[PDB]
Design a protein around this ligand. Structure first.
Ligand code: K
Ligand code: K
Ligand code: MG
Ligand code: MG
Ligand code: MG
Ligand code: MG
Ligand code: MG
Ligand code: MG
Ligand code: MG
Ligand code: MG
Ligand code: MG
Ligand code: MG
Ligand code: MG
Ligand code: MG
Ligand code: MG
Ligand code: MG
Ligand code: MG
Ligand code: MG
Ligand code: MG
Ligand code: MG
Ligand code: MG
Ligand code: MG
Ligand code: MG
Ligand code: MG
Ligand code: MG
Ligand code: MG
Ligand code: MG
Ligand code: MG
Ligand code: MG
Ligand code: MG
Ligand code: MG
Ligand code: MG
Ligand code: MG
Ligand code: MG
Lengths: 199, 74, 134, 89
RNA sequence: GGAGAGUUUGAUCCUGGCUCAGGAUGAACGCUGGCGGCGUGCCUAAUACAUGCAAGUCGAGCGAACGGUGUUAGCGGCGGACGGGUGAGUAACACGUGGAUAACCUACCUAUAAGACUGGGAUAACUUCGGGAAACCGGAGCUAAUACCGGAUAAUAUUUUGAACCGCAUGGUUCAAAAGUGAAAGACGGUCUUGCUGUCACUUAUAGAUGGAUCCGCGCUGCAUUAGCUAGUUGGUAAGGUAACGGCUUACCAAGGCAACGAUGCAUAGCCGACCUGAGAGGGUGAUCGGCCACACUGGAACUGAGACACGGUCCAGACUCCUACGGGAGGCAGCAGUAGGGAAUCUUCCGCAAUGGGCGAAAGCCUGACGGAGCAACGCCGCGUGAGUGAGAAGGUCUUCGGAUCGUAAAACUCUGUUAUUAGGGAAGAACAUAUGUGUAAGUAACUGUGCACAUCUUGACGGUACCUAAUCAGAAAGCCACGGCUAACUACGUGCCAGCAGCCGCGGUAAUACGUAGGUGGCAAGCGUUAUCCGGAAUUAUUGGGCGUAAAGCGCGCGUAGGCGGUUUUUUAAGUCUGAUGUGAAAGCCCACGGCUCAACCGUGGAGGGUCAUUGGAAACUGGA
């Protein structure tokens, strides 16, 4: 991807399961490194807004420059800024491919898009940051409809969100409509991230 | 045809056309005046008279206006 | 003041002064005149290297006397542990005054021109002109 | 003389042209008299000609002369035919 | 659409400065470095420049020469006043914005009309005789033209007679109606009748379009520790002069003109759209793109021309450089590259006229360092990588209250992928044309050729075998930088012992340092990360928005009084301010919104919005101003 380090270490430090399951904060729900077991003090006001930003950023696996650019894009549309930001992140072709169920992990959904296994509205899209619009159709390229990564992920039929429609036999998905804040991760207090970019 | 600029002022030598320049920052109107050397033909007007002037082609090194009408006698 | 006083005598902001005046001047040799250019660094020649004692602090702080390319004399601090400088050395000088050393307003750039990098440095090497080991 | 010609816009390897009326001595991308259309030779299917027919005939009747490419553009929009028909009639 | 924090004390609340957290750049430097797209790249010496290229073209204007229908030098026409560079000078009608010219000029282009008659004499080329190292210069003859010059015809142009009507004073638009006065050219074709006629070219007149010129209102940096400036100066008359008005110039007459509303002098500066910052009000900048101006080694002129007082023209003076055979000659990169120098610092002595634009040409075409591309540089922005899934606590490092903890699902192991990479196969768009060739039609013709218009056929790509696409092979080539006491996210060990060193501030180090150096771990970023410089912010720290003056900085020692600022009640009036519509204008690009094309995004394009203290014009009348 971009960051190729331990996602277990990042989930323990941030106090949020990045895999979405909870196996990382399983035995050691404390920060990595030498001073992990030793319990540190409270977090400052800056340290709380910053930790919220890193929660979102490392979940969607983006660099800070791209992350801040998406925030500015989201701040131009009518509505609540922080919620528009969460909606825009969920519309990434990176995250749509994972939310549909074509990959086990969010990092696997990135390599599929990056390596050109995915089509959008019938044409190849190689860009993980591609911003899928409602009504679009995401499918798998013909030479890759029988690959073990895609096959194994599809048979574990997880909760495909209600703003998405997938057809497992067709290996094809539909971006029905824009998500709502309730359909998006609730462990992120996005009001802190808006404050973080105000200072 | 077309219109030539007209001013009204007082003779200061035988024309002063005092106007206001609003301050750019503070908004207060400040009086300022500019002397318009004008052509009187037969030396008709005198000091302190309030006169009307109209713009013309250059008549000398500094004269660009002609005295058309006398408004208030000295 | 009153609005009329402000119209008669408008506000005037304080003029800011530069902390590194020797960097913001050039010299035209042909016209024998001084320019104003805002350079980030200046080349110079070491006139006298040596040491100086600090103002609570106590040490022997290494420095050099430098004649810059604009014919201005300055005192520049030599950061890091050991240096290879002496008289007639060609050095690059940047801004940044060193506290506790009165009259030293500039720094010598380690690893530029004749100044060597700090020997044995392994952390923050780019601040001391040291190449990556191995 | 006065010309009806193409000024280049767009980016590298992606040219877009505005159709302008300009003095011959004016620099290609500089001062113009009046824009009368656009021209996109790299478009997907059709070259996307967008000429203002009433403006083009006013300048043609005023002595403005097209360049070779602008003459082909105006011809493809029938402006040259209407110019010739209105001149004789 | 607006965030604070540290620091004066034993402690406090104020006042007040300082410092820090943000954004930005034509950046530079240090360490590091994979790719693609788009952009940007001498800010310093308007320093000096080796070498090549940056303006030619026309044989359908003309003679000759040399070659076998071609070409060369020359005459002639048009171009060389554009395009390109630079910001030295300039504080000024230079520029921005709004107007005026009844004081203006305008090649090429378009339209209309009337014409294009008749003669003549040169001269370069060339031949020959010389002179000079050269650059080049003389003598003798020779010759053409769409070159030049006479004469004829042509008036709307000039003078005088007046007249009508109109304007904003000078005046202007017609009506005449007499007197003078002013042109031109052929080339290549068709038909043939040597007459007519097509295209291009030529003359005159009038319009249009284009470009240029002048004037005026308002707007334009500091210094008063710059207060006097001017004597063609200010006005008049006359003459001269100019495209044009005018002290523009001169002669004579008068003593005016400018200035505390800042004249003048000194210094600095090209100006604007825009750009950066800011919640805004403001503050800061003018590199890149576009408009305007100015300049072309320095200074002064003029010639040709529609246009220049002319970057790659002339003349002169000067500084400098170069050749000389010492008589004499030559040159001007602030065009594109490039060199030297200066500097912290800024690129190839590249490819092509295929596209767009420009000059010349009937055209084919030629020329075009404009331009379109390629090359170099992480300089910036945007995008994508450097693997993915599963994987229980291996070794090794570090710490240990020697139980363990941590690096760490990290590694290995098992599978999976090929964006990229390598090898191979295919391979766009960007190209529109013009010419020519056919038909058709329009005008014109006596008719044709031709001309305009339409359709059909033909040729043409620098980039470039590039973008892109397809197949195979391999996790194999592809992570660094800064920080971790507080501000401020992230701590332990060892070494050192007020040393060595660190430091933006508080300050840290004098034997148990989370601040020095290293190590492990962690945090922040990531093909970048830090440092320095500079600008705005934080800074309400110049306070109009938005501060103060008893004791913190700050009320002149106190009168009188000039300019200026401000000013009680009512009625009528006005309409400068104020308010409210209309019209015009505020280019394009940019910013913001919307949509479209780039796989996305940058970016590109299209349609809107915004931005004036703008002008002109119609209303209102409470307030300020005028009566
Ligand atoms: K204290
Ligand atoms: K060309
Ligand atoms: Mg095409
Ligand atoms: Mg590029
Ligand atoms: Mg320069
Ligand atoms: Mg020079
Ligand atoms: Mg010839
Ligand atoms: Mg002509
Ligand atoms: Mg002639
Ligand atoms: Mg200057
Ligand atoms: Mg503010
Ligand atoms: Mg002349
Ligand atoms: Mg020239
Ligand atoms: Mg030159
Ligand atoms: Mg050059
Ligand atoms: Mg150097
Ligand atoms: Mg062309
Ligand atoms: Mg050439
Ligand atoms: Mg670098
Ligand atoms: Mg902390
Ligand atoms: Mg350090
Ligand atoms: Mg110790
Ligand atoms: Mg510290
Ligand atoms: Mg340390
Ligand atoms: Mg990036
Ligand atoms: Mg500041
Ligand atoms: Mg500030
Ligand atoms: Mg105060
Ligand atoms: Mg008081
Ligand atoms: Mg006191
Ligand atoms: Mg006091
Ligand atoms: Mg007192
Ligand atoms: Mg006293
Ligand atoms: Mg794009």
């Amino acid at each position: 991807a971009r960051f190729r380090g331990s996602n277990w270490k990042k989930s323990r430090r941030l106090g949020i399961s990045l895999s979405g399951t909870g196996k990382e904060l399983e035995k050691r729900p404390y920060a990595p490194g030498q001073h992990g077991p030793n319990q540190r003090k409270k977090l400052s006001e800056y340290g709380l807004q910053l930790r919220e930003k890193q929660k979102l950023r490392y979940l969607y696996g983006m660099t800070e420059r791209q992350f801040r650019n998406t925030f500015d894009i989201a701040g131009k549309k009518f509505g609540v800024h922080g919620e528009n930001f969460m909606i825009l992140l969920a519309s990434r072709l990176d995250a749509v491919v994972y939310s549909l169920g074509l990959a086990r992990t969010r990092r696997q959904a990135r390599q599929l898009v990056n390596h050109g296994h995915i089509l959008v509205d019938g044409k190849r899209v190689d860009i993980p940051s591609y911003s899928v619009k409602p009504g679009q159709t995401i499918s798998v390229r013909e030479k890759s409809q029988k690959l073990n990564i895609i096959v194994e992920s599809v048979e574990i039929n997880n909760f495909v969100p209600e703003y998405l429609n997938f057809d497992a036999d067709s290996l094809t998905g539909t971006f029905v409509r824009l998500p709502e804040r309730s359909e998006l991760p609730a462990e992120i207090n996005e009001q802190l991230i808006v404050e973080y970019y105000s200072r | 045809r077309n219109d030539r600029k007209v001013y009204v002022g007082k003779v200061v030598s035988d024309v002063l056309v005092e106007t206001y320049k609003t301050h750019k920052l503070y908004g207060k109107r400040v009086k300022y005046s500019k002397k318009y050397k004008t052509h009187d033909e037969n030396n008709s007007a005198k000091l302190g008279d309030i006169v009307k002037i109209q713009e013309t082609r250059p008549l000398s090194a500094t004269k660009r206006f002609r005295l058309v009408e006398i408004v208030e006698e000295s | 003041p009153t609005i009329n006083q402000l119209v008669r005598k408008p506000r005037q902001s304080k003029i800011k002064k530069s902390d590194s005046p020797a960097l913001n001047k050039g010299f035209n040799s042909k016209k024998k005149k001084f320019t104003d250019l805002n350079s980030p660094q200046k080349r110079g020649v070491c006139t006298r290297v040596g040491t100086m004692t600090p103002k609570p602090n106590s040490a022997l702080r290494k420095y050099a006397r430098v004649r810059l390319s604009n014919n201005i004399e300055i005192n520049a601090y030599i950061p890091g542990i050991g240096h290879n400088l002496q008289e007639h050395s060609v050095v690059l000088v940047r801004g940044g005054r060193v506290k506790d050393l009165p009259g030293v307003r500039y720094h010598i750039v380690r690893g530029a021109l004749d100044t060597s990098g700090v020997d044995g440095r392994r952390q923050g090497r780019s601040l001391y002109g040291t190449k990556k080991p191995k | 003389a006065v010309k009806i010609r193409l000024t280049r816009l767009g980016s590298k390897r992606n040219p877009f042209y505005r159709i302008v009326v300009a003095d011959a001595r004016s620099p290609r991308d500089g001062r113009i008299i009046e824009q009368i259309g656009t021209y996109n030779p790299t478009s997907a299917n059709a070259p996307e000609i967008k000429v203002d027919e009433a403006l083009a005939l006013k300048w043609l009747n005023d002595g403005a002369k097209p360049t070779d490419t602008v003459h082909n553009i105006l011809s493809k929009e029938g402006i040259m035919k209407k110019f010739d028909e209105q001149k004789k009639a």
